């Protein structure tokens, strides 16, 4: 339910210059992932941080 919404909005906007509606359209495409999305995002962030730390440890000039 992302392409149809954008198409309907672009076909309905009669040269409207309201930034609030544009922001609501830009933020309305992404849905919510409760109790399951934020945890995965945090896990991926921690994995990336650990990868950066390993890359730094393999680079002895920083130490």
């Amino acid at each position: 339910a992302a392409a149809q919404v954008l198409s309907s909005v672009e076909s309905e906007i009669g040269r409207t210059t309201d930034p609030v509606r544009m922001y609501m359209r830009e933020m309305g495409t992404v849905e919510l992932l409760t109790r399951e999305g934020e945890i995965d995002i945090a896990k991926r962030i921690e994995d990336g941080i650990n990868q950066v730390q390993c890359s730094v440890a393999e680079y002895p000039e920083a130490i």
Partner: protein, 50 residues
């Protein structure tokens, strides 16, 4: 002639068109459009002349 020009078929399409006319640039939803249509005219604290 009005029915011939009007492309809407049921009450849902009518509410969608009204919601798109009132606030364009916003995706139309059934619940929000119904609430707006009930609060604009069918509200006692909002719509009452004298």
């Amino acid at each position: 002639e009005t029915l011939r020009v009007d492309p809407t078929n049921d009450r849902l399409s009518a509410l969608v068109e009204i919601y798109r006319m009132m606030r364009p640039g916003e995706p139309p939803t059934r619940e929000a459009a119904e609430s707006l249509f009930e609060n604009l005219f069918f509200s006692e604290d909002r719509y009452d002349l004298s």
